Design a protein around this ligand. Structure first.
Ligand code: BCL
Ligand code: BCL
Ligand code: BCL
Ligand code: BCL
Ligand code: MQ8
Ligand code: UQ8
Ligand code: PGV
Ligand code: PGV
Ligand code: DGA
Ligand code: H4X
Ligand code: HEM
Ligand code: 8K6
Ligand code: CA
Ligand code: CA
Ligand code: CA
Ligand code: CA
Ligand code: FE
Ligand code: MG
Lengths: 44, 66, 66, 257, 272, 318, 43, 44, 74, 73, 72, 41
């Protein structure tokens, strides 16, 4: 079960379907795994 | 390979490109890779059709698994 | 978004035909599958469940080696 | 070229037309079979004259049912038996107005209390015996324990009063099941009540009949012979209980809100 | 026009609202308060559908379409040309459907019978309200409902189905389809049996109830009975409608992955 | 409220009924009838007896051979393990031959078992057809149940034998599974451009919806007048009582026209049969006459046309 | 004629209490709106 | 022809007494719950 | 003009009091739910406006949670 | 205007007490469930707010779990 | 304080046995529901790996580690 | 009505109230233990 509420992104004309659906609790697992690495200072 | 992708395939990776970290993410062996799937164990005189199993890489359907 | 995916397909084929599969001579038996071929690259090898790998932070511009 | 066209006419098109014509034609035949009962209809004219009309499409030609055990022939569409003698007064002076009963509404045979005029013969089994009979004539039946035997219980009547007591069960031999309960009323007559208008409470040992009131059980129609029932009598009994759904209390026919 | 036997049943009373003012017939129809309401709302809805076709690109019957608002309107009020017409029509539709059910209740009360038909109609109404009210409210926007157009609500159905990669693996969807299929089978057998018993082989008498029981006990070994097949019928149709409503309230509000991945709870039981 | 007539409150038993007498020269009926209390809460309580003659034994030998074959191949696909069989049961199936074999008879583990199971299932259903016909005709009844059964058999043979032969491949037929046959359904819609633009598919959906509507309406109406003896339809047909009169007034007042107690059963018959007739017509034309249903619908002025605003470049044209 | 069975005295009684109750209800509504205006004015 | 419940005037008085007492107690408990919630997590 | 509304109390001799009471009560409950839902879906919404403070954001930045999340990188 | 609510107790001679009681009870239970679900779906949610502490995060950073995860690498 | 006196008459209009059964069934359903709602949140107590993770503890036993070493 | 007299109703009420009080006591105890172990507010 994915209990409500959700986040929906519309990606097309109205009344056509065409939208992406996110569960905030599942998307947190993808956010909690990215970890951009830290910069390395430019070289002389 | 990384130089080739970053220069010659911008129709796909447009000006963001890739580094090692895009796949290794700090480990020597990447996490999500694949090989040619043999399928479940069946009798020796039975050839594989390549479907009708659980199918973990095709979103758990009964579709062709490789 | 259908037009980048079209290029992505071709890109992945390049990575696997020119670079990764010919490495099957160099790697040990640990990095191979049941049929004796090395691990290869998918869409999931860099996206890992996001619409752009790492949400599209441009890391590769800072390094002229890539 | 993605959407190039070679020829406009194809087979799918023709076949679709053929289907439109094959429907559109079973509608015709079914609508004609629909009019073997109740027709020709009566159209009321500009100043009250009534004529017989027949509709669109027209009525079919009569067919015959041959009933078993020399039960006669039935032609349909055919003649009708004569209505009985209902009295009604119209409420508003136009053809589409409603009617009011003239006397006591319970004993009038109009509205939900109307009934049909069927044969004066019982319904038969495949062997020729009467179908609905009391459980003392059908000597092989038994109530399954695990179920409340209604014989003995009382017949509370929708206003809380007592109607009488259950004394017999009437069964159906062609399909084994209960059809009627027989009860002795307040004036010591034997009357029937259909089992589909009874709520049976085993622990209270009551039968609740929400249709009519307690005093109303004295005027339920009676049978000729108590070893069988005919089609006409079934209709009369059931219709009397159905009249109470609108006439028992003077407030029942009077707009909820 | 009246049938041969109709006059003795046309009495007054039995109504819910109104009273003696709307208690008449027009031709064969019975009107009532809710009859006036239903025709009012049906006429208004139809005329608004036609106007929404007039301001569109074509009056071809197959290509008319009136669409709901965008998802950015939320549960608010959209402009007339970009969604508000859809909202007015969807109010008219609810008004008309409920009026229809209550008129049925008035008629059944007048004729002295049970309220089984309006009760079964209530479940169709419930499925419609699930698709236009409950699911949109739980997801947070009117623009999750379907547009009004032949061929154009089918594009909605298709894309919504593919938002879950494979909608055949939805469990309540499987259960509802089971009920639909079994209902068509049962209706074919019931129709055939009654026709066969009153239209026997040439030069024979009408058969009886014993014949009806015998035929199915010979073929299959069990016969359900002449009153229980009507029950079985009400049951299968109502259940089809019910599980359709459930399957749509599950999709989006309570499950956002692919539908094949739900079923994964079964081979992951720790018992094989 | 008032009793709704959904369950039987009081049950009664008499000795079992053996059945209407058959014509002389018939076999006896097999089995001693038993009674079910739970089945009696909702319907008739007797189970059995049963009639097994010549055609219903050949059927039941064919069908069980087919079932043994299907079950054993599903079981060989997991390596004979019954634990895995129960674990992954909805994903298993028996698959048709590879399409490159055409209409030849392929080797046994590459599609020949599918072919065997299909042949035996076919024979089973045709023998059952003959049984149904003879059973209804020996009791002196009309044979209306055989006509509808014939329609259903024809749909089973169309998708499965006739269309694969007209296409030139057995690999165009469904497999024997649960999720596998659902996958077949989706794939054949995807390959031939969207079944929603197939017009026979739309008409059969019209008639399936209509079957549900009509049977809710009829089941309701007869339960609502069963207090006036309406569940006994044969007598209401051959001697119209007040139950039939009320039943037909209800619909006349509500929607302006009505049927009779016998005619509504013809409406039922036809609504159940047109569904499958359109099923046959829609499958038989797919692939053999029409290759893309959406392009067909566009050519005949049926599909809507959403506004564009953008331009996408087909990379095969560049 | 449509009638409710109440006499004229019973109707007078019912009317008295009905009007009192409706006035009290509207008083409570006004109070709620004054509080809401003090907290979050909308016009 | 007039709506009645079969209760006399004494029975109605009795019912009314207990009904009002119960409703007052219930509303008291509601007020207490809201005071605690405001102290913990104020929402306006 | 002051004697125009004298017979008003006779209203309850043609309109049923019990039906009217039930209708009023049910309508008021339905309208209460509707107006609350309409105001919650506007700029006047008072549950999600993060006034007087945002509580999810308050929980993400507690010192204990921050110190645990820092020790998760190392 | 202070003795205006005298005959109020007569209400139960025209409204059925048992029906009213059942209606009130059922409505109150439904409303309780509904308001709890509406407040849980907002910023006021009190189960997932990680106050007074996040417990899953607390379990991921226990020294024993950290030392076992290190010993794998 | 003596204003709840006739309260015991409640059981002369409400059936005691039906009420008892209703209460019991409702309480069981609510118990299951609240346990499942709390298990699906940050307060979950079965999978939080407190006071220790046991699957992880089994993967790093010296015997299992030495056997996994011998297979590569 | 329910068929209970006034004496039977008094008896039932006595035991019902005692049982409900005991049940609520156990609930409070469970919550005190849970607050000591894992406070949620
Ligand atoms: C790619 C798309 C997916 C798919 C996506 C969906 C989606 C999305 C939906 C379904 C829904 C359904 N699908 Mg599916 N479905 C697929 C494949 C199938 C297949 C098949 C053989 O493959 C079948 C058999 C079904 C069958 C079904 C039913 C279970 C259900 C539709 C019945 C219904 O909603 O009744 C309910 C009845 C109504 C909504 C009717 C309302 C009636 C109103 C009240 C009365 C109107 C009167 C009118 C205005 C009056 C006109 C009067 C004139 C005078 C005559 N689907 C494919 C895989 N399916 C639908 C559903 O379950 O919704 C609840 C749904 O939304
Ligand atoms: C910025 C918006 C404001 C807000 C602005 C308003 C305004 C303005 C009003 C309300 C009103 C109400 N609000 Mg508010 N309200 C807000 C947030 C809330 C929240 C919440 C979870 O946030 C809730 C649960 C409520 C709930 C309520 C109800 C108590 C009341 C509607 C009653 C009704 O429908 O009677 C209809 C049902 C009947 C009439 C049936 C008859 C019942 C009889 C009369 C007895 C019932 C008693 C009743 C519950 C009142 C209790 C008072 C007692 C003396 C304690 N509001 C926010 C904070 N709210 C209305 C009100 O209070 O009316 C007096 C009102 O005018
Ligand atoms: C931030 C929000 C606060 C919160 C703010 C509020 C507010 C504000 C209120 C509640 C109320 C309730 N809350 Mg709370 N509540 C929170 C978290 C919880 C959690 C949880 C799992 O986290 C649960 C299980 C509860 C459960 C409850 C119920 C005890 C009660 C609703 C009763 C009802 O629906 O009557 C419906 C049923 C009936 C009316 C039937 C009546 C039966 C008779 C009268 C006796 C039954 C007794 C009943 C159990 C009440 C307790 C009395 C006893 C002394 C125990 N809350 C969070 C922390 N909660 C309401 C309340 O307590 O009112 C008193 C209330 O006003
Ligand atoms: C972090 C959260 C906590 C947690 C916080 C709470 C809180 C808070 C409560 C519970 C309550 C319960 N918890 Mg706990 N609980 C946790 C983990 C568990 C686990 C587990 C496997 O993890 C289980 C199996 C349980 C099981 C239980 C039940 C014993 C009890 C619910 C009773 C019920 O539903 O009666 C419903 C059924 C009826 C009312 C029917 C009638 C029952 C009659 C009276 C006889 C039954 C006996 C009774 C159940 C036991 C009586 C005590 C005896 C003297 C032993 N909890 C975790 C550790 N749990 C509740 C409780 O203790 O109630 C007193 C409670 O308030
Ligand atoms: C709209 C307009 C311009 C209005 C102007 C006219 C004015 C001014 C007023 C007229 C008055 C009123 C109030 C009219 C309302 C009616 C209007 C206008 C429209 C409604 C018409 C309507 C909804 C019809 C739809 C009909 C359809 C498509 C039905 C679908 C199902 C179907 C095909 C059924 C056929 C089979 C039938 C007839 C089933 C009924 C039936 C069943 C189900 C039994 O079980 C049964 C059992 C025993 C005996 C008889 C029966 C029986 O007849
Ligand atoms: C005239 O009366 C009739 C009979 O009585 C004489 C019949 O026996 C019969 C034969 C009917 C039967 C033997 C019963 C047929 C049984 C069916 C279709 C079973 C379906 C019922 C279910 C509950 C299965 C559905 C369950 C899930 C989806 C889970 C008919 C058709 C009839 O019309
Ligand atoms: C009975 C079926 C539903 C019961 C479950 C209700 C539980 C949860 C529902 C709440 C989930 C809603 C979706 C949240 C995510 C989408 C964003 C949203 O809308 O959620 C909030 C709204 O919640 C809202 O309506 C809340 C409104 C809920 C009221 C439900 C009561 C129905 C009764 C009406 C009967 C007449 C925030 O609103 P805003 O962003 O300020 O609005 C802006 C736009 O709407 C208009 O410009
Ligand atoms: C010396 C050899 C001894 C053989 C002696 C027996 C004679 C042959 C069978 C008798 C027979 O052909 O009888 C028929 C049996 O049909 C049947 O097997 C029909 C089944 C025969 C074929 C079985 C295999 C099926 C073939 C493929 C499918 C055909 C599909 C056609 C369907 C339309 C009809 O059966 P009944 O009318 O119920 O019986 C009544 C009396 O005859 C006996 O009580
Ligand atoms: C044929 C079976 C048809 C069952 C009807 C569909 C129930 C959907 C789940 C609803 C639960 C929920 O509110 O949400 C569940 C959600 C959807 O999916 C999930 O998280 C589910 C996680 C696991 C739950 C699986 C239990 C299945 C039990 C159903 C009955 C027996 C089979
Ligand atoms: C372990 O189990 C044991 C062995 C113990 C037995 C248990 C059996 C079990 C559990 C079985 C489970 C079965 C299941 C789930 C079956 C699922 C079946 C489904 C849903 C099937 C759906 C569709 C299949 C169709 C429509 C097939 C149609 C095939 C046809 C019409 C075949 C035609 C072939 C013909 C007529 C033969 C021509 C051959 C020839 C010789 C003429 O070619 C030249
Ligand atoms: C066949 C599998 C692949 C598919 C279908 C695919 C598809 C896509 C799509 C559609 C985008 C555009 C995303 C958007 O604009 O929303 C994208 C972006 C991107 N992909 Fe992939 N991809 C695949 C494999 C890969 C691989 C293997 C890598 C790493 C080597 C990669 C690296 C990227 C990067 C870096 C971007 C972002 C480029 C930008 O900012 O526009 N992709 N991919
Ligand atoms: C001449 C006196 C009568 C006036 C004509 C009646 C007009 C009826 C009002 C329109 C419909 C009412 C709107 C809501 C109906 C109920 C919704 C289910
Ligand atoms: Ca290259
Ligand atoms: Ca706030
Ligand atoms: Ca918290
Ligand atoms: Ca733990
Ligand atoms: Fe029938
Ligand atoms: Mg397949």
């Amino acid at each position: 079960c994915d209990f409500p509420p959700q986040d929906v992104v519309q990606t097309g004309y109205r009344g056509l379907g065409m939208q992406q659906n996110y569960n905030p609790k599942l998307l947190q697992k993808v956010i909690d795994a990215t970890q951009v690495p830290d910069a390395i200072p430019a070289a002389t | 390979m990384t130089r080739d992708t970053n220069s010659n395939w911008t129709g796909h990776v447009a000006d963001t490109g890739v580094t090692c970290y895009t796949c290794h993410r700090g480990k020597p062996v990447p996490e999500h890779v694949w090989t040619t799937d043999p399928g479940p164990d069946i009798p020796s005189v039975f050839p594989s059709n390549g479907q009708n199993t659980i199918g973990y890489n095709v979103a758990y359907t009964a579709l062709p698994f490789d | 978004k259908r037009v980048p995916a079209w290029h992505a397909i071709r890109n992945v084929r390049d990575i696997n035909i020119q670079y990764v599969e010919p490495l099957g001579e160099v790697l040990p038996a640990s990095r191979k599958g049941p049929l004796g071929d090395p691990f290869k690259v998918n869409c999931l090898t860099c996206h890992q469940g996001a619409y752009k790998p790492l949400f599209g932070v441009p890391m590769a511009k800072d390094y002229p080696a890539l | 070229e993605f959407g190039y066209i070679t020829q406009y006419f194809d087979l799918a098109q023709v076949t679709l037309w053929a289907f439109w014509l094959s429907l559109l034609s079973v509608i015709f035949f079914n609508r004609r079979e629909d009019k073997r009962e109740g027709y020709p209809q009566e159209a009321v004219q500009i100043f009250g004259k009534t004529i017989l009309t027949e509709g669109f499409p027209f009525m079919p030609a009569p067919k015959t049912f041959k009933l078993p055990h020399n039960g006669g022939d039935v032609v349909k569409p055919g003649p009708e038996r004569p209505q009985y003698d209902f009295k009604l007064e119209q409420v508003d002076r136009f053809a589409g107005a409603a009617y009011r009963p003239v006397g006591n509404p319970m004993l009038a045979g109009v509205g939900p209390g109307a009934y049909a005029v069927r044969a004066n013969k019982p319904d038969l089994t495949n062997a020729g015996d009467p179908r609905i009979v009391p459980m003392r004539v059908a000597k092989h039946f038994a109530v399954v324990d695990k179920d409340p035997d209604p014989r003995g219980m009382t017949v509370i009547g929708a206003d809380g009063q007592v109607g009488g007591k259950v004394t017999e069960i009437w069964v159906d031999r062609a399909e084994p099941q209960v059809r009627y309960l027989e009860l002795e009323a307040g004036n010591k007559k034997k009357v029937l009540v259909p089992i589909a208008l009874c709520v049976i409470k085993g622990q209270k040992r009551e039968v609740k009949v929400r249709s009519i009131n307690g005093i109303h059980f004295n005027d339920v129609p009676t049978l000729s012979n108590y070893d069988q029932i005919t089609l006409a009598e079934e209709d009369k009994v059931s219709a009397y209980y159905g009249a109470g759904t609108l006439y028992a209390t003077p407030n029942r026919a009077e707009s909820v809100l | 026009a009246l049938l041969n036997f109709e006059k003795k049943y046309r009495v007054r009373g039995g109504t819910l609202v109104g009273g003696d003012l709307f208690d008449f017939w027009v031709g064969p129809f019975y009107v009532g308060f809710f009859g006036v309401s239903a025709v009012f709302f049906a006429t208004l809805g139809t005329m608004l559908i036609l106007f929404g076709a007039a301001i569109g690109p074509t009056l071809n019957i197959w290509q008319i379409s009136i669409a709901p608002p965008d998802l950015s309107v939320g549960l608010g009020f959209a402009p007339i040309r970009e969604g508000g017409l859809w909202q007015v029509i969807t109010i008219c539709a609810v008004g008309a459907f409920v009026s229809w059910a209550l008129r049925q209740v008035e008629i059944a009360r007048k004729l002295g019978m049970g309220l089984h038909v309006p009760f079964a109609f209530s479940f169709a109404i419930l499925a419609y309200l699930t698709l236009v009210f409950f699911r949109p409210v739980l997801l947070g926007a009117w623009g999750h409902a379907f547009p009004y157009g032949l061929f154009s609500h089918l594009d909605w159905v298709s894309n919504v189905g593919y938002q879950t990669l494979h909608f055949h693996y939805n469990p309540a969807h499987m259960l509802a389809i089971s009920f639909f299929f079994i209902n068509t089978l049962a209706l074919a057998m019931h129709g055939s049996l009654i026709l066969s018993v009153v239209n026997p082989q040439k030069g024979e008498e009408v058969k009886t109830a014993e014949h009806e029981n015998t035929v199915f006990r010979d073929i299959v070994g069990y016969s359900i009975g002449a009153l229980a097949i009507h029950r079985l019928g009400l049951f299968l149709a109502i259940n089809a409608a019910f599980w359709s409503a459930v399957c749509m309230i599950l999709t989006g509000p309570f499950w956002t992955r692919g539908w094949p991945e739900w079923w994964m709870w079964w081979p992951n039981l720790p018992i094989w | 409220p008032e009793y709704q007539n959904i369950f039987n409150k009081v049950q009664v038993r008499e000795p079992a009924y053996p059945g209407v007498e058959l014509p002389k020269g018939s076999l006896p009926r097999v089995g001693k009838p038993i009674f079910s209390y739970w089945l009696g809460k909702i319907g008739d309580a007797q189970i059995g007896p049963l009639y097994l003659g010549g055609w219903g034994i050949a059927s039941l030998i064919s069908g069980f051979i087919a079932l043994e074959v299907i079950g054993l191949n599903m079981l060989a696909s997991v390596g004979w393990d019954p634990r895995l069989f129960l674990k992954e049961f909805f994903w298993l199936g028996l698959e048709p031959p590879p399409p490159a074999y055409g209409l030849s008879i392929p080797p046994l583990a590459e599609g020949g078992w599918w072919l065997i199971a299909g042949l035996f299932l076919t024979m089973s259903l045709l023998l059952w057809w003959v049984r149904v016909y003879k059973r209804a005709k020996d009791l002196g009844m009309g044979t209306h149940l055989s006509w509808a059964f014939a329609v259903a058999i024809l749909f089973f043979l169309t998708l499965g034998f006739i269309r694969p032969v007209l296409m030139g491949s057995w690999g165009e037929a469904p497999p024997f599974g649960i999720f596998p046959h659902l996958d077949w359904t989706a794939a054949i819609s995807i390959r031939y451009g969207n079944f929603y633009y197939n017009p026979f598919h739309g008409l059969s959906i019209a008639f399936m919806y209509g079957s549900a509507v009509l049977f809710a309406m009829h089941g309701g109406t007869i339960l609502a007048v069963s207090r006036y003896g309406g569940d006994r339809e044969i007598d209401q047909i051959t001697d119209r009582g007040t139950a039939a009169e009320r039943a037909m007034l209800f619909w006349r007042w509500c929607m302006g026209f009505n049927a009779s107690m016998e005619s509504i059963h013809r409406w039922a018959w036809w609504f159940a049969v047109f569904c499958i007739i359109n099923s046959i017509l829609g499958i038989i034309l797919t692939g053999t006459v029409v290759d893309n249903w959406y392009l067909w619908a566009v050519k005949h002025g049926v599909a809507p046309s959403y506004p564009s605003e953008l331009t996408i470049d087909n990379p095969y044209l560049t | 004629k449509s009638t409710t069975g109440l006499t004229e005295a019973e109707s007078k009684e019912f009317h008295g209490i009905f009007m009192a109750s409706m006035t009290l209800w509207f008083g409570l509504v006004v109070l709620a709106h004054i509080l809401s205006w003090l907290y979050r004015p909308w016009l | 022809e007039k709506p009645s419940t079969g209760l006399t005037e004494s029975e109605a008085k009795e019912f009314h007494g207990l009904f009002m007492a119960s409703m007052t107690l219930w509303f008291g408990l509601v007020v207490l719950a809201h005071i605690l919630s405001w102290m913990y997590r104020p929402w306006l | 003009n002051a004697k125009s509304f004298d017979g008003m109390h006779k209203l309850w001799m043609i309109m049923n009091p019990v039906s009217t009471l039930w209708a009023i009560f049910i309508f008021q409950i339905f309208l209460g739910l509707l107006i609350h839902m309409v105001v919650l879906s506007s700029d006047l919404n008072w549950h999600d406006d993060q006034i007087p403070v945002g509580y999810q954001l308050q929980g993400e930045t507690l010192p204990v949670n921050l110190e645990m999340k820092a020790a998760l990188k190392d």
